[PDB]
């Protein structure tokens, strides 16, 4: 029962960052709520682990989410469960709330920015530190920030811009990345793009192109404001690289 006035029962679509409330019907029994959100990569429901119900006072039929559901999760399906007992995990349903998140004052989902960042860590809502010069030894990080797209499958392909201002398809990834929380970092092994651009031919002006699989959302093309430069004559010392899997060991067994 979404409230913000008082909206009627049923699943609703809400903009992010709005103070709303949920109501339940059948003194002041022990209400035990639970929160579920769709996993970005899996697409299946999962419990919100860091879900807290602050106790400002005595329990009331209405729960107030004044902080507003997160703009980073614009495009998710938040679900609230209630009851006098362990809440449901959703077909026996009488006490359940389904909210679909859309961007705050955003007309349509879109890729808000694509940059060549220097740090692998990435989070929504801030401008990541972008870099201009990288070497073939290093591993680049492509930071994609989108608005209103949560857990969206996206292809990314790397173009090269020559001295004549022509962008030609240089490389593409074998797998489509998934925009998780309106933000994603793609580790690009830069040696492959070098090899390919050396085959095709100062510095190499590598740009990026992000195309969602959905037809409605447009594509983002990188430009002079964010394009990386491969040094043809240079090498990292040991080399910005990815650490998602890490380096374990070389033991004897």
């Amino acid at each position: 029962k979404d409230s913000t006035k008082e909206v009627g029962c049923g699943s609703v679509q809400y903009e992010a960052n709005l103070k709303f409330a949920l109501r339940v019907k059948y003194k002041a029994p022990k209400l035990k709520c639970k929160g579920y959100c769709t996993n970005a990569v899996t697409g299946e429901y999962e419990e919100i682990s860091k879900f807290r119900v602050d106790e400002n006072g005595a329990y009331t039929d209405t729960f107030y989410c004044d902080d507003g559901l997160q703009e980073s999760h614009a495009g998710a399906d938040y679900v609230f469960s209630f009851g006098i007992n362990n809440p449901y995990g959703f077909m026996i349903v009488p006490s359940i709330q389904k909210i679909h998140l859309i961007g705050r004052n955003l007309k349509k989902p879109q890729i808000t920015s694509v940059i060549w960042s220097s740090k692998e860590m990435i989070k929504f809502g801030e401008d990541s530190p972008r870099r201009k010069s990288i070497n073939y030894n290093e591993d680049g990080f492509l930071h994609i920030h989108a608005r209103g797209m949560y857990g969206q499958k996206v292809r990314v392909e790397l173009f090269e811009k020559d001295s004549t201002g022509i962008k030609k398809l240089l490389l593409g990834l074998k797998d489509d990345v998934t925009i998780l929380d309106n933000v994603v970092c793609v580790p690009v092994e830069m040696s492959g793009v070098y090899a390919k651009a050396a085959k095709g031919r100062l510095s190499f002006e590598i740009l990026a192109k992000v195309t969602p699989l959905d037809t409605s959302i447009a594509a983002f093309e990188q430009d002079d404001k964010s394009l990386i430069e491969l040094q043809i004559y240079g090498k990292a010392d040991e080399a910005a690289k990815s650490t998602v899997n890490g380096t374990m060991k070389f033991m004897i067994a």
Partner: protein
């Protein structure tokens, strides 16, 4: 006016897998200091997993991060209700320094992501106290057993899913409520000392979907009352 060392054991049995045991000894030095009652949660030692000291890198990293909370200064009121954690800003600065030094030592994206994800938990004192309930000793020792209680098993069926258990009225033994009895089962037994000072407690909960089980046992070992 009381102090001691409490042995805490958590045994979680998943379906189709062996039991997983976490055992620790919490050195807690309470102090009356009105309704004030400072326990200070002096230290946590002898952290054992499945009867052996932990060896995996991630578990050791979690223990290193969580050693900053000890010693707390939890402000228990009368029976276990932690009103606040007065030693929070010192804890916050200690944990920030620890996070900075792990980041400097090992710039791993997994550790960094863990740090950012815990930042929301530790950002505010109220949020820190709310997330402090995930500890078994803190949840079961700092709890008012008033014949109608609720316990959250924070990873009962799988890793990342909680489960709420409501215990009936019925040495202060309780029992799981009647609704959905074919899925929820178990019991809770608590035995006190002469004057409060919970001496032992064994609580078993059962998720019958084989039968996911979790048994929590707190025992007094080397108590001292002044």
């Amino acid at each position: 006016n009381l102090k001691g060392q409490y042995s805490i054991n958590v045994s979680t049995t998943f379906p189709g897998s062996q039991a997983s045991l976490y055992s620790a000894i919490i050195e807690v030095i309470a102090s009356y200091q009105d309704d004030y009652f400072i326990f200070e949660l002096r230290s946590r030692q002898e952290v054992k997993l499945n009867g052996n000291p932990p060896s995996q890198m991630v578990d050791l990293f979690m223990l290193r991060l969580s050693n900053t909370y000890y010693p707390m200064k939890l402000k228990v009121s009368t029976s276990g209700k932690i009103m606040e954690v007065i030693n929070f800003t010192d804890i916050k600065e200690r944990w920030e320094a620890e996070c900075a030094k792990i980041v400097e030592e090992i710039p791993c994206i997994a550790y960094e992501q863990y740090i950012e994800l815990s930042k929301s938990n530790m950002d505010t004192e109220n949020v820190f106290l709310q997330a402090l309930r995930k500890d078994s000793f803190i949840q079961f020792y700092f709890k008012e057993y008033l014949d109608d209680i609720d316990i959250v098993c924070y990873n009962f069926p799988r890793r990342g899913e909680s489960t709420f258990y409501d215990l009936a009225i019925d040495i202060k033994t309780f029992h799981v409520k009647e609704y959905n009895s074919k899925r929820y089962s178990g019991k809770l037994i608590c035995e006190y000392s002469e004057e409060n000072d919970i001496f032992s407690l064994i609580a078993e909960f059962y998720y019958n979907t084989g039968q996911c089980k979790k048994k929590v046992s707190i025992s007094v070992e080397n108590r001292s009352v002044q």
